[PDB]
Design an enzyme around this catalytic site. Structure first.
Site, PDB file in Angstrom:
ATOM      1  N   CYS A   1      56.717 -31.094 -43.720  1.00 41.45           N
ATOM      2  CA  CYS A   1      56.357 -29.691 -43.873  1.00 41.45           C
ATOM      3  C   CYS A   1      57.268 -28.992 -44.876  1.00 41.45           C
ATOM      4  CB  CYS A   1      56.365 -28.952 -42.533  1.00 41.45           C
ATOM      5  SG  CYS A   1      57.791 -29.102 -41.463  1.00 41.45           S
TER       6      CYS A   1
ATOM      7  N   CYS B   1      61.052 -26.876 -45.276  1.00 39.41           N
ATOM      8  CA  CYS B   1      62.238 -27.650 -45.616  1.00 39.41           C
ATOM      9  C   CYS B   1      62.217 -28.092 -47.072  1.00 39.41           C
ATOM     10  CB  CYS B   1      62.342 -28.854 -44.684  1.00 39.41           C
ATOM     11  SG  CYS B   1      62.131 -28.412 -42.945  1.00 39.41           S
TER      12      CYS B   1
ATOM     13  N   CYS C   1      32.719  -8.022 -41.293  1.00 38.40           N
ATOM     14  CA  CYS C   1      32.122  -8.468 -40.042  1.00 38.40           C
ATOM     15  C   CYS C   1      30.602  -8.427 -40.134  1.00 38.40           C
ATOM     16  CB  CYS C   1      32.606  -7.599 -38.884  1.00 38.40           C
ATOM     17  SG  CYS C   1      31.738  -7.899 -37.331  1.00 38.40           S
TER      18      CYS C   1
ATOM     19  N   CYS D   1      28.358  -5.749 -37.727  1.00 39.17           N
ATOM     20  CA  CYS D   1      28.218  -4.379 -38.207  1.00 39.17           C
ATOM     21  C   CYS D   1      27.137  -4.282 -39.277  1.00 39.17           C
ATOM     22  CB  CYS D   1      29.557  -3.888 -38.744  1.00 39.17           C
ATOM     23  SG  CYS D   1      30.942  -4.292 -37.659  1.00 39.17           S
TER      24      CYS D   1
END
Ligand SMILES: CC(=O)N[C@@H]1[C@@H](O)[C@H](O)[C@@H](CO)O[C@H]1O
Ligand SMILES: CC(=O)N[C@@H]1[C@@H](O)[C@H](O)[C@@H](CO)O[C@H]1O
Ligand SMILES: CC(=O)N[C@@H]1[C@@H](O)[C@H](O)[C@@H](CO)O[C@H]1O
Ligand SMILES: [Ca+2]
Lengths: 477, 668
Positions: free
Chosen positions: A38, A41, A383, A386
């Site tokens: 990852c 580091c 959204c 809506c």
């Protein structure tokens, strides 16, 4: 990079077996428990290696532990995640302090150098120590005769604020007690304490005095140094500047304000080039230079008026903030008469459709009106639901607009508008504000169908306007 | 000011993307025109393969009607450049002065519908909408609408089948079909019906869509391919990848646009099936339709659209998790390969990257939902990659093979239509589409669509021939943060994919120099919180999944209390259990302590045999049920309102597997 320091580098690779021996054979050791995979580091590795190279000159050792290989060692230390920069002192494997500052070579080097030194430094002559070494953090000095209880609380604070500041003790029998703070920006000017000697001995009083007076007068604000201003608890006044020349132009006035308003609010300079989006996060448009006052206690933003986007595009001359305007805004905010800036789009003056587009500025004014019944829909443009509701909402608004003119239908873009006092746990959220002087807002729970909405408005509406019959009366025509 | 992402810098990037699109479009006009596309490397037209009819791969897309220009119409419209849009519309009229597509071409109904008809309809909407900055008014005369209607009339005969499902290909001048091809056209054809007022398009295509949905299996998963005449599925494989993506996309989008409850119910059922069976931690694997078991070990690039689709549906967390995987794939290969194996170059069966926009679309929609500069950085890196590696003498060329780095000599229309459009929109914060309209629905080819209320009312009147919600914020977003990107700082599992699939994420030779997008030093040093920018320890415990074929019906949206409640448990239920062993790292990165095993009852109060066995070594923990990953300390309760062997219930009411209690699973 590979997240693993090169062999030629000063960094020391510590395995499961060799970790304990190395820790016991070295006084101070900053150990990094990383993982090759990852990338936190990975970005750590270059600055870590540079810090190790710098620290080797001062005999402080930096170590790397690969949790992917030394699994048992990593569980034994209760590592939460990677990179976990842990400091081992006094050859104590059990004791392990956690690094907290930024992940930069300079920050790591300063933190480790501070860890090497004792919590409080005793110096025979203050000026000699001050001139000997340049400081990057404020210096708190308890000069003069020291009371036992004040000595104890001072050392306790030094242990508490070991990383925040560097504490110095220069006891002189003849000279009277003089607590002071030396800001690195202005080493010449010490912030002497003028309060009574009794209360400062209290831990809380000293903590507050440090949190207030340990900040640069007009320092450069950034995410790393943001916590310092947050802890103080005072309102923060940002200054966005496009270039160093603009900052030098605005420095005198803002330094004077910060010195004058010391203990009330904090003023900082933020590089607009580096941090322009912060202006948007302050409910102000990206038009720099820009002075915005943030009240983190109440979460209220106050700033100077800003040119409209159309005017800004037409504008071709650099924006200038009037000193008188800045001072007036500061005075109004301190008095409390200044009005906050609510996250809101431009007021929808032109309303082609029946649905009355509400913005944050006019929301509370529109809903709180007792003359009419307001049905606000809270939506996000992204959204889907809506968008599905929009046609039915338009039909309902059209039906009510021509019928009795007593029920107002509106909607507000929650993503672009922040409404204070309304609970929106999702989208869409349809809230009916019944008419009358006192009428608690009602939230719609049923299926958002036209007849359902009409019945909801009629039942929970103060004026009890029957929309459905009005819809039918229009339907027959 | 690099990677600061101010408004000014975003305007600069938007201008760069605009210039790139104009470069490609002008090169097409100069060289490829009047042919369908222009080869970018060779700077010559890519004419339809007239000589070889058998080449359906090229013939299907290319009908020899300037498809690139028609597709770029909508991109020009979104650019808000009225002169350029008017010039393009006039050029389209000149290319088809009679207003009909009288071209002898055997073409694919689905692709042509989504591209030419979609672009023509969206362009007509833009030209006839006074609000839009590209309004034509008097200059326009409905020519685009008439052309779209003519093409729709030519394509409709494809639906004159025995079962009403369209034939895969048809000749406009005069067997296997994927579900996406069968069903998706209905979105565009219904928009056409609304605009013209002719119900026939909508009726026929909607009936085809309904039949396609009805073809689903008991699990509510649809096999990708079918035979319209025999209605027999060729492949039990199903998923969210190519050949089925547009079906779900347009189910949801038609439900949103037409306000259709039946379409919304179809979307809900299909999406629940996908979450239950196909969904995994970082992607929607491809599973057998009948059984729900994994079919192939790869995920195709076409599935990168599902993050944007989920953003539309309101599930921000799932969209973020799925989009991160394709971000990692791009980091590894510099271009999302057509297919990629997650379980073991040779890993990629199909490795060409034709510069598909799905990743760009997902990035754009996720940025719109979250406003996180993380996706802005992704877009900046994509733009840089375009300019530096994909840009050619006369266009943009994708990778013919990501493993070797060869660039194919072809510019697909969807490049200009979608990739540049979505990149521009991601950088164009002030675009009318999301600043003002707030109701547009992008088609599968990125053509904005919206039915004016007058058109809607006229169509409804003249005919002749709990509810859903959206999540306000992503879960990882903590409080408010002004200085740092929540994705970088607060997404603990941001780099879990690197370790979990390290075996199959192998950088080709040309990828050695490229750094991870999220790890760009300029971006990382600015949009990463040192306090929280921390990795997460991977799980060392064993994780396995079991299937519960309990009778009853499946609850589409189980209610969340940090607990998931299942009123009904009917149908297959994919439960992802975690084996717990002392002194080990769990799914959530915490060290298992002895207290976990303290006060544990292994006795089955519903049986007797388990009591002797009980009279421990490991426990069981549920981390995800039906694709819904539980939160830390997440309990699950199932209402009682069992026969299956190995299942038991103890005094604490926790289901036992192999006489081993499941700490967080309950049976109330
Ligand atoms: C200048 C120097 O080498 N000092 C070392 C010190 O770093 C080490 O911690 C200690 C114990 O081994 O031995 C000293 O001689
Ligand atoms: C006069 C003085 O400095 N006294 C300090 C005392 O405050 C501190 O608690 C103790 C522990 O190190 O060390 C003494 O020397
Ligand atoms: C089969 C063929 O080449 N047809 C071309 C057509 O593609 C082009 O759009 C048109 C314009 O000149 O000219 C025709 O001859
Ligand atoms: Ca698509």
């Amino acid at each position: 990079q590979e997240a693993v320091a090169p062999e030629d580098s000063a960094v020391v690779k510590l395995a499961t077996d060799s970790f304990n021996e190395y820790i016991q054979s070295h006084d101070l050791v900053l150990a990094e428990f990383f993982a090759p995979w990852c990338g936190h580091c990975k970005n750590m590795a270059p600055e870590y290696v540079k810090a190790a190279e710098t620290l080797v000159e001062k005999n402080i050792t930096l170590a790397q532990i690969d949790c992917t290989e030394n699994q048992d060692l990593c569980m034994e230390h209760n590592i939460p995640g990677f990179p976990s920069l842990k400091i081992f002192k006094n050859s104590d494997v059990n004791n392990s302090i956690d690094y907290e500052g930024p992940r930069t070579a300079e920050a790591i080097v300063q933190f480790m150098i501070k860890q090497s030194q004792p919590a409080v430094a005793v110096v025979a002559d203050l000026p000699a120590y001050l001139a000997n070494e340049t400081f990057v953090t404020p210096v708190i000095v308890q000069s003069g005769k020291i009371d036992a209880d004040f000595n104890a609380t001072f050392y306790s604070m030094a242990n508490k604020h070991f990383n925040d500041y560097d504490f110095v003790s220069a006891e002189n029998a003849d000279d009277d007690f003089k607590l002071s703070i030396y800001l690195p920006s202005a080493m010449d000017e010490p912030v002497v304490y003028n309060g009574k000697k009794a209360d400062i001995a209290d831990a809380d009083v000293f903590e507050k005095w440090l949190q207030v007076e340990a900040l640069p007068y007009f320092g450069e604000i950034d995410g790393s140094v943001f916590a310092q201003y947050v802890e103080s608890g005072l309102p923060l006044g940002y200054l966005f500047y496009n270039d160093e020349e603009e900052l030098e132009e605005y420095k005198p006035l803002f330094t004077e304000l910060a010195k004058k308003n010391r203990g009330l609010m904090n003023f900082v300079s933020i590089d607009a080039r580096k941090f322009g989006r912060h202006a948007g996060n302050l409910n102000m448009k990206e038009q720099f230079p820009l002075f915005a006052i943030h009240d983190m206690t109440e979460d209220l933003k106050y700033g100077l008026p800003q040119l409209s986007e159309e005017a800004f595009d037409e504008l071709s001359d650099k924006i200038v903030l009037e000193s008188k305007a800045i001072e007036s805004l500061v005075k109004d905010f301190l008095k409390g008469d200044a009005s906050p800036i609510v996250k809101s789009q431009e007021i929808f003056e032109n309303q082609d459709s029946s649905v009355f587009q509400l913005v944050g500025k006019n929301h509370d004014e529109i809903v709180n009106d007792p003359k009419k019944d307001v049905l606000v829909l809270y939506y996000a443009p992204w959204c889907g639901h809506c968008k599905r509701l929009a046609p039915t909402y338009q039909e309902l608004a059209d039906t009510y607009a021509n019928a009795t003119s007593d029920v107002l239908i509106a909607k507000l873009d929650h993503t672009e508008n922040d409404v204070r006092g309304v609970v929106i746990e999702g989208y869409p959220t349809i809230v009916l504000y019944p008419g009358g002087k006192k009428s608690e807002s009602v939230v719609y729970q049923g299926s958002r169908s036209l007849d359902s909405l009409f019945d909801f408005i009629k039942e929970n509406g103060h004026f009890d306007v029957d929309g459905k019959a009005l819809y039918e009366e229009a339907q027959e025509k | 000011d690099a990677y600061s992402f101010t408004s000014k810098e975003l305007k600069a990037y938007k201008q760069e993307v605009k210039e790139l699109f104009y470069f490609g479009f002008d090169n097409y006009l100069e060289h490829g025109y009047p042919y369908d596309e222009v080869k970018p490397i060779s700077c010559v037209p890519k004419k339809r393969n007239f000589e070889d009819p058998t080449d359906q791969g090229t013939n299907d897309i290319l009908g020899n009607f300037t498809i690139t220009l028609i597709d770029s119409l909508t991109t020009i419209a979104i650019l808000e450049d009225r002169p350029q849009f008017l010039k393009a519309v006039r050029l389209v009229e000149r290319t088809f002065p009679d207003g009909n597509f009288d071209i002898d071409s055997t073409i694919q109904v689905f692709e042509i519908t989504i591209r030419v008809i979609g672009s023509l309809l969206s362009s007509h909407l833009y030209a006839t909408d006074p609000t839009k900055a590209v309004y034509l008014g008097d200059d326009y005369d409905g020519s685009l609408l008439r052309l779209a209607q003519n093409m729709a009339d030519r394509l409709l005969p494809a639906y004159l089948t025995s079962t009403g499902l369209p034939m895969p290909r048809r000749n406009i001048k005069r067997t296997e079909n994927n579900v996406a091809a069968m069903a998706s056209p209905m979105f565009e054809f219904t928009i056409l019906s609304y605009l013209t007022g002719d119900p026939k398009y909508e009726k026929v295509t909607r009936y085809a869509f309904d039949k396609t949905w009805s073809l689903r299996t008991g699990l509510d998963l649809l096999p990708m391919s079918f035979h319209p005449e025999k209605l027999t599925p060729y492949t039990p494989m199903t998923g969210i990848g190519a050949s089925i993506d547009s079906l779900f996309e347009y189910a949801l989008k038609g439900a949103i646009l037409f306000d259709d409850s039946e379409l919304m119910e179809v979307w809900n059922v299909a999406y629940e099936a996908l979450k239950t069976n196909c969904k995994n931690d970082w992607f929607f694997a491809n599973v057998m339709a009948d059984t729900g078991h994994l079919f192939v070990p790869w995920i195709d690039s076409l599935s990168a659209f599902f993050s944007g689709l989920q953003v539309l549906a309101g599930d921000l967390d799932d969209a973020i998790a799925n989009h991160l995987m394709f971000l990692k794939m791009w980091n590894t290969f510099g271009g999302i390969p057509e297919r990629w194996n997650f379980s073991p170059d040779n890993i990629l069966p199909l490795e060409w990257y034709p510069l598909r926009p799905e990743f760009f679309e997902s990035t754009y929609f996720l940025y719109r939902a979250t406003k996180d500069p993380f996706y802005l950085n992704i877009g900046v890196h994509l733009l840089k990659d375009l300019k530096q590696r994909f840009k050619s003498n006369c266009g943009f060329a994708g990778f013919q093979n990501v493993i070797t780095g060869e660039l194919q000599d072809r510019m697909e229309t969807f490049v200009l239509s979608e990739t540049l459009k979505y990149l521009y929109l991601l950088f164009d914060e002030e675009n009318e589409l999301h600043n003002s309209a707030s109701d547009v629905i992008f088609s599968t080819e990125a053509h904005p669509m919206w039915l004016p209320q007058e058109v809607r009312s006229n169509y409804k009147r003249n005919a002749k021939f709990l509810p859903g919600t959206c999540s306000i914020k992503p879960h990882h977003v903590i409080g408010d943060e002004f200085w740092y990107s929540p994705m970088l700082s607060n997404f603990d599992r941001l780099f879990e994919i690197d370790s979990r699939f390290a075996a199959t994420l192998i950088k080709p030779s040309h990828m050695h120099n490229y750094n991870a997008i999220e790890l760009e030093p300029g971006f990382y040093n600015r949009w990463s919180n040192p306090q929280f920018s921390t990795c997460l320890i991977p799980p060392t415990t064993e994780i396995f999944e079991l299937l519960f074929d309990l009778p009853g019906y499946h609850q589409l949206n189980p209610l969340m209390l940090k607990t998931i409640t299942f009123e009904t448990f009917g149908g297959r239920s994919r439960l992802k259990i975690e084996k717990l062993q002392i002194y080990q790292i769990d799914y959530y990165g915490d060290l298992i302590t002895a207290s976990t095993f303290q006060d544990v009852s292994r006795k089955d109060i519903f049986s007797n045999a388990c009591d002797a066995v009980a009279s421990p070594t490991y426990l069981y923990r549920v981390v995800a049920i039906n694709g819904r990953i539980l939160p830390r300390h997440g309990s699950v309760q199932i209402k009682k309102h069992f026969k299956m062997d190995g299942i038991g219930i103890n005094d604490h009411s926790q289901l036992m597997l192999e006489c081993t209690p499941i700490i967080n699973l309950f049976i109330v």
